[PDB]
């Protein structure tokens, strides 16, 4: 079987083998994060949940500007426009909880 | 054949052709059209093969409009050469078509005969097609 086709096929099968349950969990997390970001002037706790390896250079710089270097990083920040923009950039790699 | 009679530059770079059609996508001069369902290149010579098919099927009933003109050189290096010198030479002419280009238009004949003739034309083109009546008149 030709190598071009088998490489395409192997990649397509790997991509398509994602679980809808995991996708639903991710969607729920994204909705929660957007709901929190929609607020204004609250103290929010930011957890880093996805690694920095392999991500874009710009986004690694944004995360290090937020203060998160590892998974399991905990930082409290006051939501103004700057922090809101950074969180929007890196929404897919963070978990936002609110500090009552 | 169908081919431009004068060009500024003999050879041009093969772009990437993509996206649907945003223009030339509506029936203008006729009654029935042969839209494409793909994005690809239609050579001049396939164009004239489809034109013969339509015209010959139509016993003087109506008119045929060709909505594409090739105007794009297709170069090919000589048969047995290596990758060295550069930009070999024009071989034949291509026209660009995108998903939604009308590509062919017919007037005069009954709808059944037009549909037959225009499937007869679609049998000779390299893209999936669809036969469309005006969908806003009858």
């Amino acid at each position: 079987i030709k190598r071009k086709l088998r490489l395409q096929l192997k990649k397509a099968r790997f991509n398509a083998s994602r679980s809808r349950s995991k996708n639903k969990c991710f969607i729920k997390r994204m909705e929660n994060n957007r709901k929190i970001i929609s607020k204004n002037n609250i103290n929010v706790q930011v957890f880093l949940v996805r690694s920095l390896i392999g991500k874009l250079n710009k986004k690694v710089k944004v995360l290090k500007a937020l203060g998160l270097n590892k998974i399991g990083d905990k930082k409290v920040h006051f939501l103004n426009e700057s922090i809101k923009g950074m969180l929007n950039e890196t929404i897919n790699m963070i978990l936002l909880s609110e500090v009552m | 054949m169908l081919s431009p009679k004068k060009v500024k530059y003999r050879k041009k770079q093969r772009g990437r052709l993509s996206g649907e059609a945003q223009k030339g996508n509506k029936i203008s001069f006729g009654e029935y059209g042969l839209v494409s369902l793909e994005t690809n290149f239609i050579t001049a010579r396939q164009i004239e093969a489809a034109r013969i098919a339509m015209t010959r099927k139509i016993k003087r009933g109506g008119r045929v409009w060709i909505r594409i003109f090739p105007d794009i050189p297709y170069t090919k290096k000589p048969a047995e050469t290596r990758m060295g010198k550069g930009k070999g030479g024009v071989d034949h002419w291509n026209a660009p078509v995108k998903l939604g280009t009308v590509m062919f238009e017919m007037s005069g004949v009954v709808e059944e005969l037009a549909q037959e003739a225009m499937s007869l034309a679609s049998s000779k083109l390299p893209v999936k097609t669809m036969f469309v009546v005006r969908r806003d008149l009858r």
């Binding site: - | 060295g84 010198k85 550069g86 930009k87």
Partner: protein
């Protein structure tokens, strides 16, 4: 049958050197260009090769009038 051509000059690095709103002091080069792509306004001068330079310290500004762009120091 080799290539008949393949010949290019050195890139001349034209363009705007100080962005609108930046602070410059006297004599700065603002634009390098062939021809008055940008014309001269208040407090700037034009070199023999249409370079735009600042006659005094200030802040660069670009204005548009009848579709032509003018550079000034304010």
């Amino acid at each position: 049958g080799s290539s008949k051509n393949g010949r290019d000059s050195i890139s001349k690095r034209l363009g705007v050197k100080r962005s609108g709103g930046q602070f410059v002091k006297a004599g700065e080069i603002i634009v390098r260009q062939r021809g008055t792509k940008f014309h001269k306004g208040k407090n700037v001068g034009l070199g023999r090769d249409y370079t735009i330079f600042a006659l005094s310290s200030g802040k660069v500004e670009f204005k548009t009038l009848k579709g032509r762009k003018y550079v000034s120091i304010v």
